[PDB]
């Protein structure tokens, strides 16, 4: 297998509750904001305010009005950061981040306005990828979760909150890191197949 460098360092999908809303945003510049405004043609702004959803109700709509300046996402070397530009907090679930601090990988971290958090470190990811090959195909396969980061605007979820899953928050986004996914692919294509058999029938 051969590889070409991704034109986009990440891709971002927006969600309301359990429903995907709008097109996937593909990020070509190393810094970008996901905000609640309405510029449709800026390669550095994923503007959520112009996305329609005939099905959305009042909780989602009030929340959307509070995204505001939203979240700034950028990378420096092999490290990815999120900065809360919104007047309201944002809540991040990054397995790579959680493993760094010894937390459960489903832990949700709160970012108050004006603060930033390192949500991904590639060097820690490479180390985990190196160890996963000793665990078999399925172990490597799950590492895609290390390359996906989920973030909710305004509303928290998890142990400290009444909302328990990300699909219960009104306004959230799903970030995929394309560089690390390519390195994962280079390993997966050399791992064989899983040992347990699937029948065509079951």
């Amino acid at each position: 297998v051969t590889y070409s460098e991704p034109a986009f360092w990440c891709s971002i999908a927006y969600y309301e509750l359990n429903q995907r809303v709008g097109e996937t945003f593909h990020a070509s510049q190393p810094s970008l904001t996901v905000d609640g405004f309405t510029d449709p043609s800026n390669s550095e702004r994923f503007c959520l305010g112009l996305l329609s959803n005939v099905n959305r109700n009042a909780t989602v709509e009030m929340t959307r009005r509070h995204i505001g300046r939203g979240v700034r996402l950028y990378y420096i070397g092999g490290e990815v950061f999120a900065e809360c530009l919104s007047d309201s907090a944002i809540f991040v679930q990054s397995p790579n981040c959680n493993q760094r601090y010894g937390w459960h990988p489903a832990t949700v971290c709160k970012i108050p306005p004006g603060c930033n958090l390192k949500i991904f470190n590639n060097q820690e990811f490479a180390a985990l990828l190196a160890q996963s090959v000793n665990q078999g195909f399925e172990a490597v396969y799950q590492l895609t979760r290390m390359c996906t980061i989920r973030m909710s605007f305004v509303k928290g979820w998890g142990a400290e909150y009444r909302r328990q899953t990300v699909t219960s928050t009104p306004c959230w986004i799903e970030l995929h890191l394309n560089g690390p996914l390519q390195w994962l692919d280079k390993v997966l294509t050399q791992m064989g197949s899983p040992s347990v058999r699937c029948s065509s029938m079951s």
Partner: peptide, 27 residues
């Protein structure tokens, strides 16, 4: 095998970059 080379190459590329195998291959 090729797995060990891939991991060694990624452990090195990852210390300061987010790029994939192509970017590394063009060091």
């Amino acid at each position: 095998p090729g797995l060990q080379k891939t991991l060694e190459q990624f452990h090195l590329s990852s210390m300061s970059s987010l790029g994939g195998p192509a970017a590394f291959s063009a060091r």
